[PDB]
Amino acid sequence: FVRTEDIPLNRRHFVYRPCSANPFFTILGYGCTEYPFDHSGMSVMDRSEGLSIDLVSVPDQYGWRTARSDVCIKEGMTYWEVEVTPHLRFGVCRREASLEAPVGFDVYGYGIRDISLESIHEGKLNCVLENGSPLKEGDKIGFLLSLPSIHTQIKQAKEFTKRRIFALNSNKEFQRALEYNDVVRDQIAIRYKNQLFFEATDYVKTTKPEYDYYQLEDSYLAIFQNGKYLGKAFENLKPLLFSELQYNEKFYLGYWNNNKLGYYPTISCFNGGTARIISEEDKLEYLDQIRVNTLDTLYKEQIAEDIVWDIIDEL
């Protein structure tokens, strides 16, 4: 396993991305690369500095560290398998979770433990499943993640707005004065040690939004071990339309969605506990027992959405 030496890693709420020279763009000079490879893989920008490398681990003396999948699961039904003193964790987490903390230490991520398959969220452990079947060194863990249609999440967000505009507010006037379908991204080109990356702002942890707790409509997290499901990990998945970016509100008050909102499959490594995640149907092992699309499809979809939005945002 090797570490990264000259890449800007995701920290201080900033995300980076490599670009390549694209001469069709006049205002901007560069466009996003496909990847250092064809298929989806381990996102090197949002890793911990101590997270070494489809294979990831930390040395045997390092605390919990995590990596996220590149593809952002917004809605629908996605299935995959993760191939497995050294502990690990498998789960899913939003962007607000820290790469330094084990998935499930905050309220933005939900995960499962390697030993005893316990479910971890808000830093608390759960034993919802009664099967209690131990996991060995060569097991393949499937994940079926079902999320509501975009329209229902949008209407749930609109309900949140209609509450917030006056029900939760009764500089108030400015707050009351403050696009759901439309994506607006923020990207700046930077050069770090002769290398070229894009800088984008990220989201911060805030108070949990309440009203009944916010839940994605008919959202479900299902886990399988060698074809056998072990239950639903969670139902009341948090909406995210709920996700305030880091914002210097003081600045704009004094003067007076980025297409990446969703849950990412996240892999955590502790004291050398390695694993790998599977993305593509050819190396998918239980794709038919559901009856559907693999993660790689959504990878290509995200590539297309990014390049098309890059096209339109030039003018």
Binding site: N22, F24, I307, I311, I312, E314, L315
Partner: peptide, 29 residues
């Protein structure tokens, strides 16, 4: 970038129902 980027840029520069873009998209090909 090789395939569709210049046709898209020219079409958005042209932009009137979406039918006008659908046709300009065909006429460019």
């Amino acid at each position: 970038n090789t395939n569709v980027t210049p046709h898209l840029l020219a079409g958005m520069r042209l932009i009137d129902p979406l039918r006008v873009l659908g046709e300009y998209l065909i006429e460019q090909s």
